[PDB]
Symmetry: C2
Subunit: 618 residues, 2 copies
């Protein structure tokens, strides 16, 4: 517990204070460190015998340097470190639009960890989850950030010389906002999650978005602007007939950019809309517009360098103002995929380097409810930072353990509910953590994707492994406690529905009674404990808003487990001659991975995991 005795020369007050905060994370030994800015390297550290000289190029890179220093002094007296970062900016973007809105205090902790890793930039992805004046439905009951909360988060990042970029939506993905049945909202709509191009009240809204953002210091923004298939085909088509869609996209983009210009923003956007550059009057419009933005090539999936290169080459044929968006996999349920994230980071990094890409944005999406922990992907983030600054992973685990207290190997065990043994490591989205959990009991529609001889022992062993890590994870224990309880549930739940069917089919009524009176009530108890663990996780990381969806989904699961109990009981009492749910033969849930030598699949929509019945449709 002894406080650090470290001594520094050449720091500003801002820097000394920043360092005091980071002593909460890293353990600085009793040495003397001379610090100066220098253009010579991103980071240089030299010295021995308690006397060290530390240079950084950019103010924020001091914080990574210190992580490096602590790490190297653990095993060595003499230090010979020089790092040259491949990327002028390295960013992490947190999804705050899928129900999980990262709370102010967790944003500050993430900024501290990102400063230790080497990121220059912090980003938050907000569709409807920022307050806009005069638009009371925009973010309503969503925990939308106030301008003050956004300023506060930015300002904290500024304490570490880290920049903030809001990622917003200026055309589509505004579904939580446009659902509201008041004229002031409905008149802004084209169809689904898409706003109505050409409508002045739409640009009044978009102006409002920028008015809010211009209260920040930052003048950089991601405006989204991906190509939605339905754009121009809803109430737009009804009012204005058929137009050229890329011409429509251009028309809208130009309006957005002019508004951005008025408030002094530079805009980044997904490159999709310009894929055709890689009808001449439209080609010209597009070409003029691509010159006013930074294009972002996003890819979270490819298992080799050359697949990325092919794309980068195509892009450079039209723009040098290019950033790459990789992915920290945390959008497939309760459990991340840091392993897959590693695999693809390695290849993407090579390609970014070959194509001298200047900027990398690591994305943390939270698809379909935000149920994966915000801090579950710290390893993926350290990975990218290592790849940037060192171009290898030789120091990954040690730097990670300096920063978090856990080896990267232990932390990455967080992924276990997805790591079924027969999966090859290079296919994405295979998410048993989720679909085993929310699957019905009586009507187990994912049951053909289960392999209980392998899955049962995997999940059970994962629960023990995660319990052990939890005990040494300190302030990250909550992450592993949640995952240990999930895996424990999955070890039984993975085949309970099949075991019911087997018992029903062979008329083993003793087994059905055991299942209905012991196993299922205990399964409910386990899921209620998990719900409590989950809520503790959520409330620590996020605002309360959005947790309500999870309460709804897990409440329903519990109620369906009770239904299995009651239905079995009726049948045991000889009231029912048959249980009709059990007379339905189970088909494959999807053929997406039908060709492969494993039964697992991808299933990432709660409402289709839970029931074959209608639930959202009229």
């Amino acid at each position: 517990h002894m406080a650090s005795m470290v001594r520094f020369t050449g720091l500003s007050l801002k820097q000394t204070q920043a360092i005091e905060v980071l002593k909460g994370h890293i353990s600085l030994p009793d040495v003397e460190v001379a610090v100066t800015q220098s253009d010579q390297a991103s980071i240089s550290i030299e010295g021995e015998e308690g006397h060290y000289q530390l240079t950084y190029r950019k103010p924020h890179q001091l914080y990574r340097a210190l992580s490096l220093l602590v790490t190297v002094l653990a095993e060595a007296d003499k230090v010979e470190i020089e790092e040259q970062a491949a990327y002028e900016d390295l960013a992490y973007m947190v999804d705050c639009s899928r129900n999980a809105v990262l709370n102010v205090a967790s944003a500050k902790q993430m900024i501290e960890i990102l400063a230790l890793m080497g990121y220059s930039t912090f980003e938050l992805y907000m569709e409807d989850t920022y307050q806009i004046e005069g638009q009371p439905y925009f973010g309503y009951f969503r925990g939308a950030y106030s301008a003050e909360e956004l300023q506060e988060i930015e300002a904290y990042a500024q304490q570490f010389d880290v920049t903030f970029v809001p990622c917003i939506q200026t055309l589509a993905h505004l579904s939580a906002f446009v659902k509201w049945g008041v004229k002031e909202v409905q008149e802004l709509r084209d169809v689904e999650d898409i706003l109505l191009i050409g409508e002045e009240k739409v640009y009044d809204l978009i102006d409002g978005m920028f008015a809010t953002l211009s209260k920040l210091k930052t003048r950089k923004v991601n405006i989204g602007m991906d190509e939605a298939h339905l754009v121009g085909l809803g109430r737009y088509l009804i009012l204005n007939g058929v137009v050229d869609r890329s011409l429509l996209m251009c028309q809208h983009l130009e309006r957005v950019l002019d508004i951005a210009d008025k408030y002094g923003f530079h805009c980044q956007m997904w490159s999709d809309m310009f894929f055709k550059l890689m009808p001449e009057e439209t080609r010209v419009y597009l070409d003029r517009l691509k010159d006013r933005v930074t294009l972002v090539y996003w890819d979270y999936y490819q298992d080799s360098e050359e697949k990325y290169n092919r794309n980068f080459r195509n892009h450079h044929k039209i723009s040098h103002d290019l950033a790459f968006a990789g992915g920290a996999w945390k959008w497939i349920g309760f459990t991340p995929h840091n392993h897959f994230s590693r695999l693809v980071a390695i290849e993407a990094n090579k390609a970014c380097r070959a194509n001298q890409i200047k900027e990398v944005i690591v994305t943390g999406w939270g698809d379909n409810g935000g149920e994966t922990a915000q801090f579950s992907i710290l390893p993926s983030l350290q990975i990218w930072a290592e790849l940037s600054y060192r171009n290898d992973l030789d120091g990954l685990s040690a730097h990670f353990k300096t920063n978090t207290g856990l080896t990267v190997e232990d932390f990455m065990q967080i992924d276990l509910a997805n790591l079924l043994p027969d999966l090859p490591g290079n296919l994405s989205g295979i998410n048993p953590n989720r679909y085993v959990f929310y699957q019905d009991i009586l009507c187990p529609i994912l049951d053909q994707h289960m392999t209980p001889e392998q899955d049962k022992p995997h999940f059970a062993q994962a629960a023990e492994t995660l319990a052990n890590i939890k005990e040494k994870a300190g302030n990250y224990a909550y992450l592993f406690e949640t995952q240990a309880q999930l895996n424990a549930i999955l070890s039984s739940k993975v085949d309970v529905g099949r075991r019911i069917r087997q018992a029903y089919q062979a008329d083993d009524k003793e087994s059905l009674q055991q299942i209905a009176r012991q196993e299922l009530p205990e399964l409910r108890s386990q899921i209620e404990d998990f719900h409590a663990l989950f809520s503790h996780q959520w409330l620590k990381e996020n605002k309360v808003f959005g947790l309500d969806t999870v309460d709804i989904r897990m409440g329903g699961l519990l109620q369906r487990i009770k239904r299995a109990e009651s239905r079995i009981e009726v049948y045991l009492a000889g009231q029912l001659d048959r249980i009709d749910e059990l007379e339905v033969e189970i088909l494959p849930f999807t053929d997406f991975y039908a060709d492969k030598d494993f039964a697992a699949t991808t299933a990432n929509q709660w409402h289709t995991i839970a029931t074959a019945s209608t639930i959202y449709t009229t």
Copy 2:
């Protein structure tokens, strides 16, 4: 009761209807005659009864029984205005009417004077080689549909399947396999021009041709996104109407192949009531089908007449589709159904309409009981046969054992006292129920001063009717429990807020420890009653969605409890949920002297968060 002139078929039909009706000790001579739809004459124990159509005997018997309780001398002649009067039950919104219930419903329709029974089936019938079609939905086997049609045939009632040949196939197309995804344009719409789609449609008519009936409703409504999805990516921009014509033509040829005559909604032919190559294609096909003009909403005959005349121009082989309101949650709206039927009947007569179809939709989960609308069914029978409602209540009591006004108390969870009778879809039964506790986004539409008494009085009334309801008691018990819940749940959210704002910590404690645990107990009871109601009328499939929705609401009440407890223990400065000011849920009824509204999607009642979106 002694009869003469009946077939064996007819004497057995009557033995079945003796289960619903109490024939007196009299002699009745029965014969067919074109003189009247129904005629009854006689006195002092001997009567002569005649029917035009065999099925009209069963209504005649309901009339016979009724009048003889009043008087000795009977003088009845009825001229049915409609050549066919049909009831269509929705079997696609999760609730699939079980066979035993189809049989009870058939029996009752026969007593009422209906000629035709229809089941609305999107994906809820089995198709050979199409295992995802109705998978885990309780889709009828061919055996089941034949059994149902065969039971109707016993009462000389015909059967008409109502299916979908273009759109409204959401529960089928969602399945993520090539053999289903290859059939999709977009959303709930099939891909026009795709042979594998015509192979599916052929299978639909393959299944249906196992029936005796050769009359079908094929749907063919005009969905906005038709030709705009994967059709557009494959074939580029094309005329919407032409597209529909090409599909309709393919569908009709498949029908012709199986010997079926098709009805369909008239919507695609509104424009022709256009490019010339298109007005030709249209005009042809208009003559090959019966058109169905659907309207469940209008409160004046002239509004219906306007539409009828427009329709009469185009190609007047036209049927009308009215509405027995049972698609707005847990609770029907027979009252509103009567208001519109009265005017719809006038419009149908004024325009010489041959056939009326009463539709019983189940929007967004089928949570309203199948037998909840018997009053509206009788209303249409009485309006077809007598053109008035003087005999409504008495014929209804004969058929069911309850007066029509007693039965119609089933509507009470929707009948808030400040509502005008002619605005539709106002459904506090459902949204007061499913609303969150901490985040009550429909709260500006509650009026605890009138609503709390209304619902509370309703639970008593309905408890009283339950006790004299016989085989329909389950309906009223369900609704009694619902109303009892609503009388406190209508403002528990607001009372939590007021207490919170006023630092009334003892109240919040009673709410969190007493009221809300009791509320959950009541909701669990309701769930049980509902589940009994459901499993009595429907197949088990589709119940699971209700389990889910109700499971979620109970977990959300446990959240209100726990959040309040954390606050009471000092471990929170504020309850952030309660710091959000509640806006109007919708402005649909903003300009009115009442606070209630329409909100009929579960997922948007229950949470402002995302729940189905990615």
